[PDB]
Design a protein around this motif. Sequence first.
Motif, PDB file in Angstrom:
ATOM      1  N   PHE G 146      40.116  30.463  73.029  1.00 23.86           N
ATOM      2  CA  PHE G 146      41.380  29.800  73.395  1.00 23.86           C
ATOM      3  C   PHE G 146      42.310  30.682  74.211  1.00 23.86           C
ATOM      4  N   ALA G 148      41.494  32.627  76.630  1.00 17.32           N
ATOM      5  CA  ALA G 148      41.129  32.437  78.032  1.00 17.32           C
ATOM      6  C   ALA G 148      41.923  31.300  78.670  1.00 17.32           C
ATOM      7  N   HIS G 149      42.079  30.204  77.928  1.00 21.78           N
ATOM      8  CA  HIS G 149      42.788  29.015  78.414  1.00 21.78           C
ATOM      9  C   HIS G 149      44.322  29.108  78.333  1.00 21.78           C
ATOM     10  N   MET G 150      44.856  29.821  77.336  1.00 20.59           N
ATOM     11  CA  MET G 150      46.317  29.872  77.094  1.00 20.59           C
ATOM     12  C   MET G 150      46.972  31.238  77.313  1.00 20.59           C
ATOM     13  N   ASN G 152      45.624  34.034  79.042  1.00 20.09           N
ATOM     14  CA  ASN G 152      45.436  34.529  80.420  1.00 20.09           C
ATOM     15  C   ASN G 152      46.489  34.022  81.422  1.00 20.09           C
ATOM     16  N   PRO G 153      46.802  32.708  81.421  1.00 22.54           N
ATOM     17  CA  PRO G 153      47.884  32.215  82.290  1.00 22.54           C
ATOM     18  C   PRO G 153      49.240  32.913  82.122  1.00 22.54           C
ATOM     19  N   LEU G 154      49.585  33.250  80.882  1.00 21.14           N
ATOM     20  CA  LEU G 154      50.825  33.968  80.578  1.00 21.14           C
ATOM     21  C   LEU G 154      50.750  35.448  80.944  1.00 21.14           C
ATOM     22  N   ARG G 156      48.646  36.818  83.125  1.00 17.00           N
ATOM     23  CA  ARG G 156      48.511  36.913  84.591  1.00 17.00           C
ATOM     24  C   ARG G 156      49.844  36.789  85.349  1.00 17.00           C
ATOM     25  N   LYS G 157      50.849  36.159  84.738  1.00 14.91           N
ATOM     26  CA  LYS G 157      52.208  36.145  85.304  1.00 14.91           C
ATOM     27  C   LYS G 157      52.860  37.532  85.322  1.00 14.91           C
ATOM     28  N   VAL G 183      52.080  31.732  71.050  1.00 13.97           N
ATOM     29  CA  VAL G 183      51.620  30.517  71.731  1.00 13.97           C
ATOM     30  C   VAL G 183      50.300  30.054  71.132  1.00 13.97           C
ATOM     31  N   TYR G 185      49.227  30.700  68.120  1.00 13.98           N
ATOM     32  CA  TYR G 185      49.510  30.206  66.763  1.00 13.98           C
ATOM     33  C   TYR G 185      50.060  28.775  66.730  1.00 13.98           C
ATOM     34  N   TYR G 186      50.873  28.417  67.724  1.00 11.36           N
ATOM     35  CA  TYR G 186      51.346  27.034  67.880  1.00 11.36           C
ATOM     36  C   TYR G 186      50.204  26.044  68.131  1.00 11.36           C
ATOM     37  N   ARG G 187      49.246  26.465  68.955  1.00 13.73           N
ATOM     38  CA  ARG G 187      48.314  25.565  69.635  1.00 13.73           C
ATOM     39  C   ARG G 187      46.823  25.672  69.280  1.00 13.73           C
ATOM     40  N   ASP G 188      46.400  26.783  68.674  1.00 19.92           N
ATOM     41  CA  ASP G 188      45.013  26.972  68.214  1.00 19.92           C
ATOM     42  C   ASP G 188      44.952  26.620  66.730  1.00 19.92           C
ATOM     43  N   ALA G 189      44.173  25.594  66.396  1.00 20.75           N
ATOM     44  CA  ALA G 189      44.024  25.137  65.008  1.00 20.75           C
ATOM     45  C   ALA G 189      43.227  26.094  64.110  1.00 20.75           C
TER      46      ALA G 189
END
Lengths: 204, 195, 195, 196, 196, 222, 233, 212, 226
Positions: G146, G148-150, G152-154, G156-157, G183, G185-189
Amino acid sequence: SDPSSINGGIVVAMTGKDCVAIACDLRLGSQSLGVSNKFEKIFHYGHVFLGITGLATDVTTLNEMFRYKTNLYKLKEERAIEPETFTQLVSSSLYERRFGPYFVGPVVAGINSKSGKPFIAGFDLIGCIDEAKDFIVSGTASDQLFGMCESLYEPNLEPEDLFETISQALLNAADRDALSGWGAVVYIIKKDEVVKRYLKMRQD
Amino acid sequence: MDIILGIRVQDSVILASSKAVTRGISVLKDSDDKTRQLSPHTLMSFAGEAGDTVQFAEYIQANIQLYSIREDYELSPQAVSSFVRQELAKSIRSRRPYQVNVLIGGYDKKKNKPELYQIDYLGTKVELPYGAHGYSGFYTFSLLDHHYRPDMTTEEGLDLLKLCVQELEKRMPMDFKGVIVKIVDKDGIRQVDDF
Amino acid sequence: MDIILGIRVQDSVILASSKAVTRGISVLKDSDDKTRQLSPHTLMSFAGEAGDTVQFAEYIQANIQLYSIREDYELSPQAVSSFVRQELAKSIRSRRPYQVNVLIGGYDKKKNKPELYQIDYLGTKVELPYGAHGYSGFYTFSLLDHHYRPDMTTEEGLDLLKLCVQELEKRMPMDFKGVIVKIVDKDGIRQVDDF
Amino acid sequence: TSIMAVTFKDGVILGADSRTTTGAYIANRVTDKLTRVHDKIWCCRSGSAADTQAIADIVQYHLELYTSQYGTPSTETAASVFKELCYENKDNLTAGIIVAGYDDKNKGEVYTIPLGGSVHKLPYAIAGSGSTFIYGYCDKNFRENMSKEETVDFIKHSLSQAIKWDGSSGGVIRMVVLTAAGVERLIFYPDEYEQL
Amino acid sequence: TSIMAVTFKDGVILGADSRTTTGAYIANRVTDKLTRVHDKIWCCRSGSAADTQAIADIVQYHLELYTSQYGTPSTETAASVFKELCYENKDNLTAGIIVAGYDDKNKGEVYTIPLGGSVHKLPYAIAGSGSTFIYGYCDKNFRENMSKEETVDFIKHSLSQAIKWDGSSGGVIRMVVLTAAGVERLIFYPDEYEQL
Amino acid sequence: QFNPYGDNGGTILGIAGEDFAVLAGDTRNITDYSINSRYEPKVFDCGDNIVMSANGFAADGDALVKRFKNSVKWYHFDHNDKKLSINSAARNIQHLLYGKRFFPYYVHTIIAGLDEDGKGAVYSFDPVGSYEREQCRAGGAAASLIMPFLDNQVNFKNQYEPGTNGKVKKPLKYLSVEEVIKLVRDSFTSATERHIQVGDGLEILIVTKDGVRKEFYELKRD
Amino acid sequence: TQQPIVTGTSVISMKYDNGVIIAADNLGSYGSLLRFNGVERLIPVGDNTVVGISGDISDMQHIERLLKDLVTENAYDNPLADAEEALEPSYIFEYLATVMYQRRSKMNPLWNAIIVAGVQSNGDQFLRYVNLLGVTYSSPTLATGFGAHMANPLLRKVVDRESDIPKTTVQVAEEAIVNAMRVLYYRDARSSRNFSLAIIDKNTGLTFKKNLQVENMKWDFAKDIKGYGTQKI
Amino acid sequence: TTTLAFRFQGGIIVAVDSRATAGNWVASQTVKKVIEINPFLLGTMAGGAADCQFWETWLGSQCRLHELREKERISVAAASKILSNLVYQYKGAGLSMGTMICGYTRKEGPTIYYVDSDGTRLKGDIFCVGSGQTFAYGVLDSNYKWDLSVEDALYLGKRSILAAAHRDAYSGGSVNLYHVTEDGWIYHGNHDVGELFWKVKEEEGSFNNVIG
Amino acid sequence: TTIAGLVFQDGVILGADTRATNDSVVADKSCEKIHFIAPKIYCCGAGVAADAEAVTQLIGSNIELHSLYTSREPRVVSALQMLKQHLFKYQGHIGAYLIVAGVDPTGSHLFSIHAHGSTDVGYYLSLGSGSLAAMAVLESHWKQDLTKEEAIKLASDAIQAGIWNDLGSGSNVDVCVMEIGKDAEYLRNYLTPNVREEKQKSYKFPRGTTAVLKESIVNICDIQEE
Ligand SMILES: *[C@@H](CS(C)(=O)=O)[C@H](Cc1ccc(CN)cc1)NC(=O)[C@H](CO)NC(=O)[C@H](CC(C)C)NC(=O)[C@H](Cc1ccccc1)N=[N+]=[N-]
Ligand SMILES: *[C@@H](CS(C)(=O)=O)[C@H](Cc1ccc(CN)cc1)NC(=O)[C@H](CO)NC(=O)[C@H](CC(C)C)NC(=O)[C@H](Cc1ccccc1)N=[N+]=[N-]
Ligand SMILES: [Mg+2]
Ligand SMILES: [Mg+2]
Ligand SMILES: [Mg+2]
Ligand SMILES: [Mg+2]
């Protein structure tokens, strides 16, 4: 088994300065067997041109269907249909078969008779419209055509230059596809003259 | 049904169609005519799934014959082929499609021209100088590509057809028991009884 | 490979074997000899999966020829057939079995008697007056049941075999391109060149 | 199956139900799932009965041979031997084992070995099909350094609920107490634990 | 999902977590799974979100039309309409619904409707993926005729454990209190319930 | 079930000039719709004036390049530091690839260098080791987009002398290194527009009698 | 061929000016059951390398032992084991990458995704990824699952290319990592609140932080969200 | 893929196309489907590109070792059988090959052996192998006689591949010609189909189906 | 696709990228994924492009007729309820994933709709293959009582996260701002961070390069008349 690649074939359309061009190969096959070298994939209803790739029975069926619909349109409206309106008609007609679709890749090309604006559009088999400024590709060598068009194309080409660009895009794409080729046709379309040219290409 | 060939020459259309009817293990018949006369100057040969072939052919025959009586007029080969294509194109999206491929050979009395149409079970129509269905074309099209000319006589067309049948008899695994040949021209339809 | 027939008459064994070699779409050859001489008075015809047939036949041939040199003696047709059966019976429980059916026609010089053995790919051996493999027997056994006599001459055996081949040419769907016929008797093995 | 091992002040207690099922038929209603691999190193078995018995028998053999050469093995050593068999043969085993033991140096220790063949040292462990129903209860009620009587009640109440809800669990509640004092077996019948 | 409804002296309380997952991704972390079919008849939804929303919307329509003609429906009547939809369309639905309501005559009532479309009237009910972990806890700690404050604690502690162990459950604990006094919404955040 | 293969995307391009050769490749590495790296080198200097790339499944690509590099090392030891010619390298790679005929390296391999007459050479292999010497070859995800363009621009296909009706073909010429690099850059810019797996950066390795030189160009990062 | 049983979720990491940061939560999931809450998935090797592992925990514990055994073996007949001949991040990675690819090639993979973070002898940052297929890649930010999907975007900024690395301080990089963990913890079950974080700096060495918690969480907006469309209460 | 070889009065004609495909993708138009084993042996390739190249190159090594050991040229029969026995070992593994081994030796004369990956080995006068074989057979069988001029035979082989290149989607590119005699094989050039087709159409008056 | 929606002080805002794909090829570089329903109700679409397009047009058509019939401004809950009941009916076979936002007499609203017919309420949402990249940004930076200027920044940032980090998403950023008491402002090509760089060469051919077999004039007019 994949209906869109039994018969084979390609269509490409391009815009130029006060003109559009639409072109197609002439092959119809049964997979490996070449059957016909005269199967044209571009039709016209007044001044609006429609190219159709994919399953050949549906190519023929849709031509007959849009001839039907544009004839009735003309009788009721008392004017020929325009490319923008026809595009919406193609989309409507494809999407109404959403769950039993025609296996085709249609391409609209034409010049709006009132505004004089060049217009091209492409669709998937269920009617999603791609309205492009530059070019539209369709068929079994669509990847090859995307590559040719994306490098060869430049905006605002004159009719006789645009002819050379679209022809070379078609011919070189077709030569890298087993199911395309066997001849080709290019329509150069201006506001009140249309020239049709048959191209010399390798017959394998 | 196995081999159906067609060749359009100068002034006529020649249809050749195999005589064998095989059901699995045995050859049940060796004199089967895989054709129907649709109108006096239009002949349709057919091949495909058992039962469906004849049912479809006779259904088309009845409809064209009905048209002929109603209008006191023979439909052009082009019109007949378009009717046949639509029926097959309607068929392919049915509950149970007709698995039938056809050749339609006709002489257009208006234009004074022979015409040969090849239509497969999907409703894929093409006008051709010569045509075939199934595996026949794999052997015969290369011959016809070599030897065909548009200005051939009917006798030259028949000699070219013998060469096609000889090649099929040499290289095809199935014994199709020879062919019944029929010629369609301005005078109507006749069978070549010795081939 | 398609049709292999065998018929044991008074003083000889006659093996008839089809000439066609088909790979799927095309007939690659129309003069293929589906037989090997195992010893001077023993002939084996064979049919089955491509490659396996010839590999097996030649492997048997080499072993029997090796036996002949070692002992300066020809094995009886019975002994050769038992050797062949065991090899096939060993084969069927291998990683990759030989898919080969055979007929072994031999003249036993000790007993002065012709002998015909039919062995399938499982190693199922049977001595018969006449035999066949695959679909051939479906057509030909009823003829042989009717017309066969144990005291037939070689010429009568060949006429009875023509009647078998004619029936196969009439009713089988595949064109097997005629048969090569070979006679096994006291004088050895010879081919009938006109059939 | 409902099984659990719980460390406490004086050592460790293993607990288990006694039901073995073949589908919905109870093949054995008085099974002993608490099994001895060494004097004061026991285990609770869950999963394939064939597999867990085969493993436990091999471990007992290894620890017997260890003891002949190197003296008494630690509970950690026993858990490692269990792990080695379970992990290396994970493709062919369905075994979920809890290992519990008493040293004088380390006191009570509990190791759990789930399907994969991983090892986890814990204050207490629960396993088997019936354990799903008591994660909430056991987490709320477990305390460290309980007395013997408190730990027996904790196990009895826990497995009582596991048995109540799980069809695959049932019968008697067996327990085995491991302390310096020795090895004590306890048994508790339905009429006792059902009314809790 | 972890959901529960609990009757008590003054009426009934519905409770739920707020997590909606698409596989292991949390699609919505602040979902409202407590949904109103009538003024004082609510339900907790579990299973397919599409299915339970479609059902609840139909039930709300039926009870609105019932009220126009025949006055306020009973909680039993609401549970029956839920059942009729769930049972008759069992082949095409994945819905596990708890129905809870307050009459002045009947006081607090709870009905549970699991996958099959059966109905069960209970003093309290638990459902959803996270409920498996608290069967033991809830059975041991539930009493009849609890006060409002005791029932709020019971639900808060229960769903806290369900959330702790179930990955499919999480977020905030929402509650809806149904009494003669009216309809009260409560919310409890992770920092409150996690430390319980 | 465990799938031992994957697809790391990317695209590569070899062009053989008169006295030089280029091997270019994009620097993007992907799985599914995620970018793993925006700069992961794919085209390698293998020694002996040979450059190599094995595009497709990156783990098999790395393994193959690693084995070929080692093959060059052992060719030196076993044959008195003899230079491995590009034709000999090619045959050696065929045997590396075919050795795994029944569990293939899931890669399209291209090598570039100079032949023994000093002329530019490109060799291209399928996954199981069939190879051919070519003047022009693109491999990988956008090979279908790039190759028809190269047929037209490198080999002058379908192009005729104007005014000859269509009976004198455009005559074949060697391109300058500057011309080749322009065609390489435009190929990748075009491919980046239409293929989602192509982008981030373009690294070109140029091989001449003087050695191996590198050039890097930015590509669109969407 | 197997299937993973007890699993660990995202490992996230990034380079900064003087070193690397790596982080991973302390959870061992058993499908949807959040079974084990005290699992350390960052494993230091010497004082210059941290190996972060996600995926199957039994295979992680095997890898953990291989690395422990590697340190022992390196010390054998090696007077410079704690100096010039100490284990490097690049040696540890290449070993693991060899093992991963060999195991996939025998159709019996170690069901993991691994990130080796460290600092080399010459002060260079090392950050490289390897997984069950033997696929390897390096980048200024790396994350598994997860992350990689959530993440990395942050991340990489902050570090979008190589040239951003010298501009990024340890405070900025750690802040980005800690936010990314929230992030997730909010979004990965299949994640947890408790995590471990490791900084490997070329000056200050290895700092290993245990028992961190996701904090400053935004939940207050939840109270106003009502129903799934038309509901007003 | 279209490959063919036939025997006649003046030796053996061998002709092949040059296309390689990966599905409907035309991978190459310049492939070599004839391997030159020695001055008197040729091998044609159809099926898997790698399988043919590898094993027919290997065959050449085995043929070389034979002549070192026996101080004599390998027979066409022996060479074909080395390859057929090899592919037979691999049977079921999934090798894909259709091939012809063509050569002259004093003891055999001109000889052609068809060998394929399911273990078939056939001697014969005419063979066509590949996806376009049926098209080549059509033209070849019609104009075949034993006593063609070497010039006519070379043309027929060329023309037969052209016929297949046209009709078969998976065949094309160019035609490679060979002639095998007492003295060895002789290459008779690479003929691009995109030029040959139009040349043949005009001179022969064939291909009347095409718009020209 | 990266689509997103979020609320601010007195409004709601939607964002979307402009890339359409067929497997790994880019079908359309500039497509409008923010669909129109009413003057002040808009819909971001993801999933099957034809389906997302068709379903919004149909509900938009019915919303218009409903508005005429009732003589009222359409509500976002009406579009929401009509969309979900249609999508539910087809059991996910219409593969449209939508973020619906708008203003009406009730206030400002933001919903998401899934292909099987489920709906969510949220203060910030994202859908499509770039949703996780976008949601990471929204979770890091969203707060209560955002200004319009902050909201447009955050929305476009969320879409950008998808554009750069997701292969499915690309090209430009479209935005639509719906504020209470004001006309909705639709901002196509709000950002243009992916313009193609100038080509190295011009591939315009010499005239007569292509070989031609035949030429003819096509009669496109009606009746050439006497
Ligand atoms: C025609 C044979 S046919 C159509 O009648 O079956 C040619 C004959 C031929 C070509 C080339 C050579 C020597 N170079 C010799 C004979 N054969 C082909 O076109 C085959 C048809 O399958 N093509 C291939 O083998 C291609 C060649 C590449 C250059 C494109 N390779 C593949 O298809 C493999 C398949 C593969 C293998 C392992 C793993 C994955 C995929 N590569 N690909 N893709
Ligand atoms: C992103 C959605 S995603 C990757 O997150 O799932 C966009 C959203 C979108 C694009 C365009 C429009 C236009 N009004 C609205 C929303 N969706 C896409 O890119 C889809 C992804 O499937 N693309 C398509 O549907 C394309 C559109 C082009 C033809 C213009 N269509 C195809 O790929 C067709 C459709 C198809 C549809 C359903 C199921 C399978 C395949 N395939 N074909 N052929
Ligand atoms: Mg072509
Ligand atoms: Mg949770
Ligand atoms: Mg891109
Ligand atoms: Mg062709």
